[PDB]
């Protein structure tokens, strides 16, 4: 297993980037907390290689499958990417995942640096 | 609006860039699909003063920016110059792009010429 304090800071940034809400009071993370199924969206599958969502980042830093606060990022960044990739440039899916990216880099350098 | 059938040669020449498979069955243009957010990688935005992506490639086919086969090589190569000035010689983005301006130039001269 981890060490508790690394279990901890990413919780506590995974916390920070899906509770995240704009200045509307929208919470951004909703559409990426799960992915819809491959019976819904398949153009999804299609597209996109390495499907990740919230929920499967939540179970990873359970699981301790991340070893460290590089290994979160990367799948934050691939969710994000991956919405980017999928959608139409100006969206608002599109452009909600960029706003997250920021959120995920300051609340790590907050939390952890 | 661009004439019917440019548009088409503009898909098709596009659709075979994008489609392409090495012969370990790897779709080559999977990386340069859609570029990574300045927030994931800002190195590349520093260094790059054009970036280009096939999603706006493919944008630029559907709003007639590219007004001939032309038009549409020039970003086609400058994407995949960019890859070329970011990444270094013999990494596999760099060889995969040199190899899609093959794929491209082949597709032009086969559906046009
Ligand atoms: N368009 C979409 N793009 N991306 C996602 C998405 C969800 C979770 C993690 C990563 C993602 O990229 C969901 C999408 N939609 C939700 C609303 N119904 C249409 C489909
Ligand atoms: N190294 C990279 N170089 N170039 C691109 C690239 C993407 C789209 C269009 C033009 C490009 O040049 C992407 C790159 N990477 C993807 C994988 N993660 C590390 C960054
Ligand atoms: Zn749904
Ligand atoms: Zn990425």
């Given at each position: ?5 690394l ?19 929208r ?38 499958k ?37 959120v ?10």
């Amino acid at each position: 297993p981890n060490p508790p304090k690394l279990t901890k800071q990413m919780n506590a940034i995974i916390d920070t980037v899906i509770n995240y809400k704009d200045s509307s009071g929208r919470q951004l993370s909703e559409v990426f907390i799960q992915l819809p199924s491959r019976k819904e969206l398949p153009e999804y599958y299609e597209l996109i290689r390495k499907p990740v969502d919230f929920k499967k980042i939540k179970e990873r830093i359970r699981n301790h499958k991340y070893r460290s606060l590089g290994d979160l990022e990367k799948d934050v960044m691939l969710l994000c990417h991956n919405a980017q990739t999928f959608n139409l440039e100006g969206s608002q899916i599109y452009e909600d995942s960029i706003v997250l990216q920021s959120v995920f880099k300051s609340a790590r350098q907050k939390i952890a640096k």
